[PDB]
Design an enzyme around this catalytic site. Structure first.
Site, short mmCIF file in Angstrom:
data_model
loop_
_atom_site.label_atom_id
_atom_site.label_comp_id
_atom_site.label_asym_id
_atom_site.label_seq_id
_atom_site.Cartn_x
_atom_site.Cartn_y
_atom_site.Cartn_z
N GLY A 108 0.78 -1.22 0.00
CA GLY A 108 0.00 0.00 0.00
C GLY A 108 0.81 1.27 0.00
N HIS A 121 41.54 16.29 3.27
CA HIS A 121 41.40 17.52 4.02
C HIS A 121 42.75 18.09 4.41
CE1 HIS A 121 42.44 15.95 8.08
NE2 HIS A 121 42.06 14.81 7.53
N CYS A 163 41.26 9.18 7.44
CA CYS A 163 41.25 10.25 6.52
C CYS A 163 42.57 10.37 5.75
CB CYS A 163 41.06 11.60 7.31
SG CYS A 163 39.28 11.94 7.59
C1 LIG Z 1 38.98 12.04 9.38
C2 LIG Z 1 38.87 10.61 9.97
O1 LIG Z 1 39.80 9.90 9.93
C3 LIG Z 1 37.56 10.15 10.62
N1 LIG Z 1 36.45 10.77 9.93
C4 LIG Z 1 35.41 11.49 10.69
O2 LIG Z 1 34.33 11.67 10.21
O3 LIG Z 1 35.69 11.99 11.99
C5 LIG Z 1 35.25 11.16 13.05
C6 LIG Z 1 36.31 11.30 14.22
C7 LIG Z 1 36.80 10.16 14.87
C8 LIG Z 1 37.73 10.28 15.89
C9 LIG Z 1 38.19 11.56 16.27
C10 LIG Z 1 37.71 12.71 15.61
C11 LIG Z 1 36.78 12.58 14.60
C12 LIG Z 1 37.41 8.64 10.54
C13 LIG Z 1 36.34 8.09 11.57
C14 LIG Z 1 37.06 8.16 9.11
C15 LIG Z 1 37.33 6.64 8.93
CL LIG Z 2 43.60 12.59 11.36
#
Ligand SMILES: *CC(=O)[C@@H](NC(=O)OCc1ccccc1)[C@@H](C)CC
Ligand SMILES: [Cl-]
Ligand code: NA
EC number: 2.3.2.-
Length: 354
Positions: free
Chosen positions: A183, A283, A301
């Site tokens: 539905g 980044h 990252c």
């Molecule tokens: C940039 C990264 O390595 C992380 N990405 C994110 O979105 O930030 C989460 C984070 C985790 C721990 C400390 C600060 C920020 C990783 C989780 C991507 C694999």
């Molecule tokens: Cl980092």
């Protein structure tokens, strides 16, 4: 003799019909005569817009019809020898719930060669096959593609190999009046169109710790980088470029781990290009410039210098590709959200519509 032709009337619905789908317009046709009068109202007496062909042989509704309506259709046909009138009343579909689709990329956008078509729904889709049948995708030059579902609400469509630059893609989501299961009917249609831009592929090789950007086969930038450490490595595979941010706040507590703990940290980041739903970004990393091009220190990252991060932000568009190879990690999940290309084509082609 004593014979005269009598006008006949035929319609795309029948009197007393129920469950009529609003995915098609209602029509009336005259034979051995012409339509002299046609009207259509709902249960409240509100008229429905229609159009009559110049030859007076065909009348058709010109506005989409509503759900849970009871329409009444009157039509008279006059001819050289007689007249005929009919009154038809029918009931349209009664959905249990509606669902609105959302398509990406946006209409008129120019995307990279890795960009899939994405149709996201705001409710669960019990009949995936009907959802695929209702989505029409036109490609020029034509190329083979197939559907594959990432979760219960979003489906993806892409060819076997990366798009060819200059390809025009037209997406028509014609889900209004379609029962998508249990539905669940489409709240509306969607019509978007996008184009494929230049080939832009960046490769991060863990063996060299270099991120090499190639534009149409030519190396244009070589970025020293520091990827995920052996404890939290960056997964190998193919990443699709997503949103780009002049700056963005990366939490940590959003993942459940408190910032005020050994493995947590809060920080605002410059020139961040998303390449995975899991949080992998290209980044600016002022803090690891010394390590970039030598050792891995991040959480996943792709750390690069500020100047290279801004360059990546300025020279990369949604749909471009980032490939990671030779890391100690596994492979990026195919259903990450930006990891479509990691699913073997034979598994993607077969689909998962059940
Ligand atoms: C940039 C990264 O390595 C992380 N990405 C994110 O979105 O930030 C989460 C984070 C985790 C721990 C400390 C600060 C920020 C990783 C989780 C991507 C694999
Ligand atoms: Cl980092
Ligand atoms: Na009525």
């Amino acid at each position: 003799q004593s014979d005269l032709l009598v006008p006949k009337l035929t319609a795309s619905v029948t009197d007393g019909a129920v469950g009529v789908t609003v995915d098609a317009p209602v029509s009336v046709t005259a034979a051995d005569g012409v339509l002299a009068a046609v009207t259509m109202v709902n249960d409240n007496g509100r008229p429905v817009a229609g159009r009559l062909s110049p030859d007076g042989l065909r009348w058709s509704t010109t506005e989409q019809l509503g759900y849970n309506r009871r329409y009444t259709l009157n039509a008279t046909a006059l001819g050289l020898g007689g007249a005929a009138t009919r009154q038809l009343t029918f009931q349209t579909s009664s959905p249990a719930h509606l669902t609105m689709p959302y398509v990406m990329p946006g209409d008129g956008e120019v995307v990279g060669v890795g960009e899939p078509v994405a149709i996201r729904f705001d409710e669960n889709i019990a009949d995936r096959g009907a959802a695929e049948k209702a989505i029409k995708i036109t490609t020029n030059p034509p190329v083979e593609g197939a559907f594959y579902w990432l979760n219960n609400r979003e489906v993806r469509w892409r060819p076997e190999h990366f798009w060819k630059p200059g390809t025009a893609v037209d997406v028509a989501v014609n889900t209004y009046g379609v029962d998508l299961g249990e539905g669940m009917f489409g709240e509306d249609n969607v019509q978007t169109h996008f184009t494929i831009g230049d080939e832009v592929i960046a490769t991060a090789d863990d063996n060299t710790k270099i991120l090499t950007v190639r534009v149409n086969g030519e190396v244009v930038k070589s970025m020293p980088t520091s990827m995920g450490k052996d404890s939290t490595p960056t997964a190998n595979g193919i990443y699709i470029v997503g949103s780009r941010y002049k700056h963005i706040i990366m939490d940590s507590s959003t993942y459940g781990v408190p910032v005020n703990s050994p493995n947590g940290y809060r920080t605002d980041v410059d020139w961040a290009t998303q390449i995975s739903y899991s949080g992998v970004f290209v980044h600016s990393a002022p803090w690891s410039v010394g390590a970039q091009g030598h050792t891995n220190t991040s959480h996943g990252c792709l750390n690069v210098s500020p100047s290279n991060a801004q360059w990546f932000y300025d020279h990369v568009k949604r749909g471009d590709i980032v490939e990671v190879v030779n890391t100690v990690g596994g492979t990026l999940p195919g259903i990450d959200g930006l990891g479509d290309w990691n699913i073997p084509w034979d598994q993607w082609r077969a689909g998962n519509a059940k």
